[PDB]
Design a protein around this ligand. Structure first.
Ligand SMILES: NC(=O)c1ccc[n+]([C@@H]2O[C@H](COP(=O)([O-])OP(=O)(O)OC[C@H]3O[C@@H](n4cnc5c(N)ncnc54)[C@H](OP(=O)(O)O)[C@@H]3O)[C@@H](O)[C@H]2O)c1
Ligand SMILES: O=C(O)C[NH2+]CP(=O)(O)O
Length: 309
């Protein structure tokens, strides 16, 4: 159950290590520990500002021969201020340089939101997005070999469809918040109809992110299934996603939890308990408030997510 196949033909490891909110000092240790524990997928982003430290952990892993480059799946993201087409390949080169890699396995457009280059998310820096023109430039990065695959993040069904419709190179991945508390059934079917792979982020419901206020591991359905199967709630939440055909990016800096997050491969959730996830109530934890604004192109949360709310 360890790989899913993207529409490019390449294999994406089912479990990846999320690196959002891993302070520079400790992210290297975590990438190092996870890969020695058997991880083959690392999810990065340039806006996280820790890619230099991630790069050095990767090179140490290569230097000790723990793995080779081709053994690993490395993702990063194009941040909102580099959507202009000549800015795209330069932003990829910067993340490539910091990671000390020659190519990424996956390069995602982080958000369907644009601000002028070199500025922060603030209403005097908003630029109306042009996803098609940005995707054209993502495509040339793919053509040049710098990104094995390209895809997107935080794209609703409608937005993903609107991009597929115009694209030459179909996005390989839509990476979105997805967990037993936010099951993304609509987008999940749409991805299956389109050949687009869904990677689940915040698959534990991000318990450490205060502002999102997630208590997914504390759902009684998940706790019940956890002890009927003799597994932790985290394992069962992750297993649920993998069984729906989604890859998962659990974020951890604890070595013992890093390893248990990998132990999702050789046991199943029977259909009888799988059915009970429909009894979990549904709240989107990461609402995208920072780009919903009277001056944003998204004035409502419904406008950003296209009703997937
Ligand atoms: N593209 C996007 O918009 C976007 C947005 C958010 C996240 N992501 C990606 O997806 C990754 C994961 O999402 P996330 O970081 O928001 O949340 P998450 O992985 O659902 O949960 C992270 C929290 O869960 C804890 N945890 C980890 N393993 C556990 C276990 N076995 N039992 C109990 N608790 C556990 C971690 O603490 P410890 O560190 O102490 O283990 C951490 O505080 C990110 O790191 C990032 O790479 C992408
Ligand atoms: O989605 C991401 O991981 C990057 N921005 C996160 P935010 O600025 O909403 O905290």
């Amino acid at each position: 159950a360890r790989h899913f196949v993207l529409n490019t033909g390449a294999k994406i490891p089912s479990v990846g290590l999320g690196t959002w909110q891993s302070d520079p000092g400790v992210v290297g240790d975590a990438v190092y520990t996870a890969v020695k524990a058997g991880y083959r997928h690392i999810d990065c982003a340039k806006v996280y500002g820790n890619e230099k430290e991630i790069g050095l952990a990767l090179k140490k892993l290569f230097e000790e021969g723990v793995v080779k480059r081709e053994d690993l799946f490395i993702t990063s993201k194009l941040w909102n201020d580099r959507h202009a087409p000549e800015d795209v390949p330069e932003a990829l080169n910067e993340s490539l340089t910091d990671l000390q890699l020659d190519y990424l396995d996956l390069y995602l457009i982080h958000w369907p939101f644009r601000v002028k280059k070199g500025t922060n998310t603030s209403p005097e820096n908003f630029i109306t997005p042009d996803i098609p023109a940005t995707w054209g430039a993502m495509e040339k990065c793919y053509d040049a070999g710098k990104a094995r695959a390209i895809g997107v993040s935080n794209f609703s069904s409608k937005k993903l469809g609107d991009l597929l419709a115009v694209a030459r190179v179909h996005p390989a991945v839509d990476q979105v918040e997805c967990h037993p508390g936010w099951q993304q059934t609509k987008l999940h079917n749409f991805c299956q109809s389109t050949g687009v792979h869904l990677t689940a982020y915040s698959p534990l419901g991000s318990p450490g992110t205060t502002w999102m206020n997630g208590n997914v591991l504390k759902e009684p359905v998940i706790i019940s299934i956890a002890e009927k199967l003799g597994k932790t709630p985290a394992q069962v939440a992750l297993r649920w996603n993998i069984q729906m055909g989604h890859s998962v990016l659990p974020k951890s800096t604890n070595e013992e939890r890093i390893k248990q997050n990998l132990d999702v491969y050789d046991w199943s959730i029977p259909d009888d308990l799988l059915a009970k996830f429909s009894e979990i109530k549904q709240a989107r934890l990461l609402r995208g408030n920072f780009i919903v604004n009277p001056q944003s192109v998204y004035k409502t949360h419904e406008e950003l997510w296209d009703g997937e709310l």
